[PDB]
Amino acid sequence: SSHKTFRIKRFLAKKQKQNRPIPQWIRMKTGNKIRYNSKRRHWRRTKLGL
Amino acid sequence: VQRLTYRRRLSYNTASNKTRLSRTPGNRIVYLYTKKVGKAPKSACGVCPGRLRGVRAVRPKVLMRLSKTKKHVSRAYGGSMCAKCVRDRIKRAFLIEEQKIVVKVLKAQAQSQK
Amino acid sequence: PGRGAPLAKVVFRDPYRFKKRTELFIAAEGIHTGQFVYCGKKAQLNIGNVLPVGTMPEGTIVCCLEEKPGDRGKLARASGNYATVISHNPETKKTRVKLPSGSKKVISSANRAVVGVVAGGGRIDKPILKAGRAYHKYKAKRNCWPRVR
Amino acid sequence: PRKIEEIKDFLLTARRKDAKSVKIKKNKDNVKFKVRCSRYLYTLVITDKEKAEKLKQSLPPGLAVKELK
Amino acid sequence: AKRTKKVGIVGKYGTRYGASLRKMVKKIEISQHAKYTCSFCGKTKMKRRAVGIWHCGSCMKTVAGGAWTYNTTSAVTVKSAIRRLKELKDQ
RNA sequence: AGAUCUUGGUGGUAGUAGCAAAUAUUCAAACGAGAACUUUGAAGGCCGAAGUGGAGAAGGGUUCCAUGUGAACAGCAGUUGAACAUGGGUCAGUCGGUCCUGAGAGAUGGGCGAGCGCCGUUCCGAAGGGACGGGCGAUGGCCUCCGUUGCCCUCGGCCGAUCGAAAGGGAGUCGGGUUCAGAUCCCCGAAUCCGGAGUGGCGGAGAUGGGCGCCGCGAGGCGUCCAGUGCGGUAACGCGACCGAUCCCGGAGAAGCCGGCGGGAGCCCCGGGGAGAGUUCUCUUUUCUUUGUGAAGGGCAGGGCGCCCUGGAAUGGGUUCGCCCCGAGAGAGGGGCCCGUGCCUUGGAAAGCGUCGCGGUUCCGGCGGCGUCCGGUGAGCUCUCGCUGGCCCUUGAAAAUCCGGGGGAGAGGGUGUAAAUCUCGCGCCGGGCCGUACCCAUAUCCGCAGCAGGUCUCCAAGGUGAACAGCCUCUGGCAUGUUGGAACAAUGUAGGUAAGGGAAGUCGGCAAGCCGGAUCCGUAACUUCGGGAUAAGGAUUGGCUCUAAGGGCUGGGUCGGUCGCGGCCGGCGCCUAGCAGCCGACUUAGAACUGGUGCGGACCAGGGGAAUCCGACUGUUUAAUUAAAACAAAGCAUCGCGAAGGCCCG
RNA sequence: AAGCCAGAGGAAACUCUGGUGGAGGUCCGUAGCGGUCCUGACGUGCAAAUCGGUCGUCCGACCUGGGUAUAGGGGCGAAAG
Ligand SMILES: [Mg+2]
Ligand SMILES: [Mg+2]
Ligand SMILES: [Mg+2]
Ligand SMILES: [Mg+2]
Ligand SMILES: [Mg+2]
Ligand SMILES: [Mg+2]
Ligand SMILES: [Mg+2]
Ligand SMILES: [Mg+2]
Ligand SMILES: [Mg+2]
Ligand SMILES: [Mg+2]
Ligand SMILES: [Mg+2]
Ligand SMILES: [Mg+2]
Ligand SMILES: [Mg+2]
Ligand SMILES: [Mg+2]
Ligand SMILES: [Mg+2]
Ligand SMILES: [Mg+2]
Ligand SMILES: [Mg+2]
Ligand SMILES: [Mg+2]
Ligand SMILES: [Mg+2]
Ligand SMILES: [Mg+2]
Ligand SMILES: [Mg+2]
Ligand SMILES: [Mg+2]
Ligand SMILES: [Mg+2]
Ligand SMILES: [Mg+2]
Ligand SMILES: [Mg+2]
Ligand SMILES: [Mg+2]
Ligand SMILES: [Mg+2]
Ligand SMILES: [Mg+2]
Ligand SMILES: [Mg+2]
Ligand SMILES: [Mg+2]
Ligand SMILES: [Mg+2]
Ligand SMILES: [Mg+2]
Ligand SMILES: [Mg+2]
Ligand SMILES: [Mg+2]
Ligand SMILES: [Mg+2]
Ligand SMILES: [Mg+2]
Ligand SMILES: [Mg+2]
Ligand SMILES: [Mg+2]
Ligand SMILES: [Mg+2]
Ligand SMILES: [Mg+2]
Ligand SMILES: [Mg+2]
Ligand SMILES: [Mg+2]
Ligand SMILES: [Zn+2]
Ligand SMILES: [Zn+2]
């Protein structure tokens, strides 16, 4: 909602910051074995824990 | 015609969410959030139901910034009780004190005989 | 709310410090605002006065009787009810009273009571006539009214 | 805002320490002198024009006399 | 003109609750909403505020009375009993 | 090889079912490789103010905004997207939280418990750590004298921690402008609340007068003495302040639902004057749009008063829609108070808006001209205020917080350009933390989803009409609800019609059909006398032209006997069966004429009667097969219990 | 419905008539709440209970948000397990 506490806002801030694609230079690292961010979250597909 | 919206996030028609209609210099109608209607004090006698005169009817916390004269009447018990019951109390006090004098004198003259 | 007997708000003077004490006596019927009510042993027999049962005559009836010598009023409190003083014995300091149920009780002569019948009159004569009136009656008391057999 | 009724009060109002600036507004019917104090904007209305002129040169110096026209 | 033959004040209840119950509540309701002559100021303004509470509009005197009448016959007999026992108690 | 075996993968079905709830799309152009779906323009429609409009609460959490991509997703497509990627965006003393308590939750003391712990919330507590007051002192120091500090005396029951509302209580911010996305928060301009000021910031108040001796022509000066914690009004009460503690009292906060009136505003309506548009085949001085003044002060209307003074009323009077009021003081006359959201004024026109232009700063809060005017209406609708009633075996919060009064413990100076003190005017400083974007729903929430479901509110135009009904339209919005094209087979779903008969169909008039609004008549049995009842039944209903009836404002003089073609008194006269003029809503009744007898012409909108059974009625019930005769109910009856108690939990 | 006014008739008791008034777990009927019938639609649905018309109530035992309390042999139940 528009009314929110500081802890909820901070939690949503962290959840925003980690919902981003992997950097391109990661895939050229030695022994990478990572293709894409498998922990990507969409606001309409899956909902947050709170 | 022009329809209206609340200017605050309180969306319910509660007692603290009362508005009036104002036309701005910009020629538009907006809500102005009014203050609650104050009440003049009731008399401390607790008998007659009318509220006191000469005292401005405002919210209780508005009384802190008012001058002294706006909150009382230049009379004994002024701003606390009505004039009529003050007159009644003055008469009652004087007459009951006189009655005490009368009964004291009556007993003093009654004890003159063994 | 929840009772049929009106309550009387009585203001006394504190005998030990400069203060006003406000009580919540049960209104004996016939009392009015602006009336002086006198509580004590040497109080006189008038409607609304509170005085011990031992000092009242053999046929007086009372309003708010004490079950024990020292607690507040406990008997004949419901509206329209009263208790009747029957007999005394100066020895053993006992008083026989007739409770509203008709039972006879022996109490201490020091038990205080209000002279007269409690206000609220004959409340049970009027038929309720409506399930809604009973609903509102028992809404102010407790959740007991709609009773399934 | 407060409305000054006569000239003498406006002169001593404009000489107060808090007086930031004075505004002169020429309307069709009157001339308004508007001194900006710490709490109020005191306005003096002058129906005629010659008295407005004498108050124009009699203003205390060191005060912004900015014209609204 | 006369509007009802016999129901009077209980005409608001319609056909409901039974004739005898309406007849029984009729007198209680007439006494309930009646205005009694105040015994303090002499005006006919004593009307019921709540059950057992009677208040006068003029002198603002509040009296504790009956549920439906200003005083019950029981309480009047009690007041007479108390006055006679008081005058018998002293001499 | 089996176990309706476990996991994974793949077939036929099958290019099949299907992409059919809520009326609808069409033309041209642009970008683009590509257009039924994107964008723009034109046209036709829909939502029709109880919206498909404009904003919020909960919930979501970046979905908001800009740019780009066309892999996957948006059950067709897409040049589009709530997709993907890259950047950006939420600014507060005065909007909320924060404070208060509510229903309640919950420590400590105590009790219980093997024990984690739980019972209890004032009950089995030495439960006040505070105080301007006075004394003892340390002089800490600008040691004058007031601020520090320790102890003692005196006073001190929130009698109980603490938590508990973004809808309750709760001081005080409004107007204009501005962005791609933020504003009551940013900028501009006007205010306001709270807290602070020790060295006291300025004024004003307190508060600055009489008496006696002298001097002095008088006025006026000198000395002494005495007052002086304000003043006015008969009163209601008023004035700009107006010494005062512990303590006490009171008020505000602080109160249900419904009815009927009245005042004010906003909107609606009508008549003109402007400005700009629309029509002009003919007519239309015509049709449409627009035509501001915030908070906060001052003044004035208006509304209200169960406020005061004079006076004393029956031949009772006053008065409301209703009421109701009066020797406990009517009517009448004169005052006082409260609210003042209305008008004027400061704010204020400089801003805003509407038009007509002129320069450019690639993208100016640019510059300029003109205007922003006069009126009338009302059972109109919505808010708000006020008055007065009705209902209750229902009586409709608490606490923070603020204020007034009683009392006078004390403090202040010796007549001084004075003191203590000040709720008066102005001045100086500060207001920390958190939230603030967006959606708020036939696509941003829940229902596995862009799911016909569910989800709390605010605002509310014109016509018809009783109406927030239904139907049409304006402001605003949208593209027909996850696809289109071509045909018009059966069967279906939804909607109509049907000659003659009229329930013969069927378990059963199921379904459909009939009736329906308003006016005028006229209404039975039975009945608990209230009802039945819109009983039943009958007539009328359009258009046009009139005719009556139902109101409100003013003014009615007999005149120069004269000078403030006008005014004071008076010789100077009989509207007194009331007239003259002006203005104004709708409503009712009647008449004539008239149309192919059609007229509540769409919409809205009871089929009726005679009985039997059951339940008295209103209400409730098996969410998702049973709404009933079941449950409840008032009424009636019985039982237990006087508190060391009845019933019950533990 | 009570209450009230006026007129008329009455010896009174009182009665009759016309207005006023606006009561009611009152009636028709929106919104809301509910869910009778078509045993309609749908029934691999829009929907793991919905949709259309027709319906019941619509000032009260009314509808509803939020905050609270009651927890499993327990709660709560105008009562249908
Ligand atoms: Mg979801
Ligand atoms: Mg205004
Ligand atoms: Mg029962
Ligand atoms: Mg195998
Ligand atoms: Mg085998
Ligand atoms: Mg197919
Ligand atoms: Mg299909
Ligand atoms: Mg339409
Ligand atoms: Mg909306
Ligand atoms: Mg977007
Ligand atoms: Mg697709
Ligand atoms: Mg994304
Ligand atoms: Mg204590
Ligand atoms: Mg709290
Ligand atoms: Mg609040
Ligand atoms: Mg915005
Ligand atoms: Mg203005
Ligand atoms: Mg009078
Ligand atoms: Mg201008
Ligand atoms: Mg917002
Ligand atoms: Mg949906
Ligand atoms: Mg889920
Ligand atoms: Mg269609
Ligand atoms: Mg389409
Ligand atoms: Mg959709
Ligand atoms: Mg046929
Ligand atoms: Mg036929
Ligand atoms: Mg047959
Ligand atoms: Mg057959
Ligand atoms: Mg049928
Ligand atoms: Mg019938
Ligand atoms: Mg005709
Ligand atoms: Mg029934
Ligand atoms: Mg029966
Ligand atoms: Mg149900
Ligand atoms: Mg069912
Ligand atoms: Mg069913
Ligand atoms: Mg019976
Ligand atoms: Mg009803
Ligand atoms: Mg009904
Ligand atoms: Mg079916
Ligand atoms: Mg069973
Ligand atoms: Zn009084
Ligand atoms: Zn009285």
mmCIF file of C-alpha atoms (C1' of nucleotides) and ligand atoms in Angstrom, chain B residues 10 14 16, chain F residues 96-97 99 165-170, ligand 15:
data_model
loop_
_atom_site.group_PDB
_atom_site.id
_atom_site.type_symbol
_atom_site.label_atom_id
_atom_site.label_comp_id
_atom_site.label_asym_id
_atom_site.label_seq_id
_atom_site.Cartn_x
_atom_site.Cartn_y
_atom_site.Cartn_z
ATOM 1 C CA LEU B 10 -8.889 9.629 4.571
ATOM 2 C CA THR B 14 -16.091 10.172 9.345
ATOM 3 C CA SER B 16 -13.009 14.237 11.334
ATOM 4 C "C1'" G F 96 -1.025 10.858 8.291
ATOM 5 C "C1'" G F 97 1.795 7.705 11.672
ATOM 6 C "C1'" C F 99 0.212 10.985 21.432
ATOM 7 C "C1'" A F 165 -7.375 2.723 16.081
ATOM 8 C "C1'" A F 166 -3.047 5.439 9.024
ATOM 9 C "C1'" A F 167 -12.170 5.226 9.672
ATOM 10 C "C1'" G F 168 -12.667 6.996 17.099
ATOM 11 C "C1'" G F 169 -10.375 11.670 20.423
ATOM 12 C "C1'" G F 170 -6.130 14.770 18.667
HETATM 13 MG MG MG H 15 -8.501 9.952 13.462
#
